[PDB]
């Protein structure tokens, strides 16, 4: 970020990036120009010696379509909070679900991965979410270095109209009932970490009717993660088991899913950072004769070259291991390989 | 505001807020997450010793819906102007109608009130409006301390298509023909002010043919207001009598309406600011057997706690005194109570 | 632009304008309030002694419609790049097509002209375009002041769906196949410059099947321009011959078009800058019996008064010389005059 203001106990950082990005793929819904930018503000005010107030907004602005195209910009984050000494912090707004406190460890590919693969945004507490109240505590009240935890609650974000509605209604794939989540990460020593996360949300009536697949009163996720970040090497893995919470493309939700991501990278001193990763999401107990089906399955190979802290370039290659079948077709799941080339200015 | 630039006769202030906000109500169209942010810029250039040029933009960005939701951001204000010594100022663009120079005195509730109640936005010259040319004068050319006035003109903002169209067409509820407004405020003593405002706008053919209620060539408003702002106390009231200008929910406009708002607040030195208010809008001479009907009626009780000038939190309680009847049902007027809880970072 | 950050090898400029603008016309699709603003960020990082990284984003935000209106903001530019000493620069993203390196010389009217007349945006490489990779060389490797050249490539931006699709699909009028462009400008004498530009793009299947007019596998443009900018006088002209690249209003593309623009301006030291211009676009070989038709034809008279570098005001008169006929009617081409009045704050 770029600190543009710091006066009378208030500071503002302007941050973002401009990514000149192109995808090459046989999948025409993915192929082509993908240029976009992000811009945001992070503000912090010192209220007193122990209390600080804060706010953060992050906006995504696509720049790959025309000036007459619709729906090209959206808010990723918008929350306000308070932090009190070692007693912890509390924030509310649009923010990450606590499951991402651990799954973020494998969200480090040059381009692919993250909330475009084993989980998505507005997908219960797995990525960015509306209306999350989050309590966080670092170093266990200042008593245990490296031990962090979080407790999170999310109110229902319901249907557009009818009995299940809320003011901010949306379609079944992005709805949620009241829910909660927890996370615990332990940086046991500089560079070695283990993490766990859990979430439990009520599902909505539209989630149990509109989509073809997935039925159940509650959505749940269980995540374990490991991270090694030392000696110029980055290794991470995350395993998440879900119930009625993983999307099976447009078909609905998987009654059960097993998601696994693993990544290995090396950072050369001159700036090059090669990366190899494997990601999979296996749906189980799917209705309508599907049984067990792969929702996502690919090997990723790529590299980022960091010119400095403000400029980088990258290549990423998604080697898609899914086969074309009635499940991927009917769910709108891409089975093609993709090559991305990006040139990024960051601030 | 945060001054981020001040060089060679030009200054720029960045301002805004991030409001982590949740509403609790039996009305499903308002219940739920209401998080949003505002961001704006106020610029001013010293052209010469007495002439200054200025501009202001204010943007509202909702953050309570998904990244694939539409129409989540909009411009509240955007105008450019010139100010010259005691001769006054002139600006043009999207700005407040001059009726708000007086009705703004009661727009101080912790969350509710303002252009969501007795008047709205794009509602003739009662709130924010497109295409307003506004002349303002402070202290009557420097001759009368505390006496301010404004004169404003608004060109037609017509239908989307047909004979009544303009480039920036919209539906009947937000249309207007040529309009004029004036305001005058006087600080009688230190902390005590009185104000008056008047507006007169031509109504469009769609306003006089499409909606169920309200018919007349012109919309007209008359406002009187009073304010006491001293000794940590804030008291204000505004009374506005309107003709063919107050929306009767979705049914059109009230042939006549009488709007009244009153508020009392106290600012404790430690930061707490309790507030109590009463707001009503009474429609008269409504067609179709409605006769006289309450369009809005509620008591508001709340409080804001200011941690400092950059962070606050609040609770607001709208105690809705409207009864469920054929008018509130057919007009889509909410009769339910609402509780709002907000946590706000400001810059 | 306003430099708002400059630390540790990175600098950021914030720029933009707020234009309080009103059009007066018998054409109801352009008459009325036209207020808008632009905001952008320009960043540059010093990577090493010779290499710099950069990024630029420019956003257009309309402020002439209501807060409930759709599609009011869009990205004009978003690109990232690298510049290596005098060897040149390379950038990729949404940026101007290199034909504008020469046609921009007549895009100097107080309000009209530019990409709203003989060419448009997302119109091959004639104005702003998605997915352009651009190499630029300034001042011939730093050896010849004013001798500039560019080489540009654009990937296909295809249909919304079907065989011709790309991820960022759009309608036929804004599609393009793979394309290339080049430009070269230089000074002949002090204050006198000449410029040439060429572009060649593949056309798309929808361009050759959906609209009635224009058929061909390739879109090409050839431009020559001249500019005199000295002694307070500005004179410029541009002539462009196109094949399957100039829009024939809503009916398709002209198989051939000849575009000509000429402008004369004078800059008074006190700030007034009168301007007189003539613009025409002649379509040739149009199908359906249209044959040769004027697509655009007008004289422009106006003036801008610059208060300083941050504030200006203007008037512009478009004196439309087109005759009303079956072509202008069926193509939706405006034959009416327009008067614009603007007051602009810039940063
Ligand atoms: C400001 C904080 C708002 C808290 C909202 C809690 C959500 C509860 C929904 C049930
Ligand atoms: C040990 C870390 C190895 C990283 C491998 C990256 C190759 C692409
Ligand atoms: C000292 C020369 C400046 C003359 C004033 C410029 C005119 C615009 C002022 C409008 C204010 C209302
Ligand atoms: C400076 C000219 C502004 C336009 C004048 C509008 C006058 C409106 C009031 C009279 C209306 C007469 C009945 C239509
Ligand atoms: C130029 C000032 C007059 C404009 C008045 C517009 C409203 C007219 C209402 C009818 C009288
Ligand atoms: C000069 C000191 C005056 C003290 C100001 C505090 C007064 C609180 C007023 C409450 C009155 C409510 C009626
Ligand atoms: C301290 C004064 C508060 C007034 C509260 C009004 C209560 C609601 C009355 C209608 C039910
Ligand atoms: C002075 C602030 C009082 C408002 C508290 C809100 C009361 C909640 C009532 C819910 C039933
Ligand atoms: C980051 C630069 C990417 C350039 C991509 C060029 C598009 C090729 C289309 C075939
Ligand atoms: C790097 C060299 C660039 C050369 C550009 C050639 C452009 C052709 C221009 C022809 C102008 C004809 C106008 C009808
Ligand atoms: C100074 C230019 C601002 C635009 C003026 C608009 C005139 C009022 C509309 C009729
Ligand atoms: Li299930
Ligand atoms: Li595959
Ligand atoms: Li009436």
Numbering used by the authors:
A (entry chain A), B (entry chain B), C (entry chain C): 0 to 346
Give sentences copied directly from the paper behind this entry.
Mutations that mediate pore constriction have been shown to consist of amino acid insertions in extracellular loop 3 (L3) of OmpK36, a motif that conformationally determines the minimal pore radius.
To that end we solved the crystal structures of chimeric OmpK36WT with D and TD insertions expressed in E. coli (OmpK36WT+D and OmpK36WT+TD) by X-ray crystallography and compared the minimal pore diameters to those of the previously solved OmpK36WT and OmpK36WT+GD structures. These values represent relative pore reductions of 8% (D) and 41% (TD) compared to OmpK36WT, the latter significantly greater than that imposed by the GD insertion (10%). By solving the crystal structures of novel OmpK36 variants, we found that the TD insertion causes a pore constriction of 41%, significantly greater than that achieved by GD (10%) or D (8%), resulting in the highest levels of resistance to selected antibiotics. The acquisition of the TD insertion also coincided closely with the gain of OXA-232 and an ompK35 truncation (with both likely occurring just prior to TD acquisition). We enumerated lung CFU counts as the outcome measure and found that both KP36WT+D and KP36WT+TD (as with KP36WT+GD previously) were outcompeted by KP36WT.
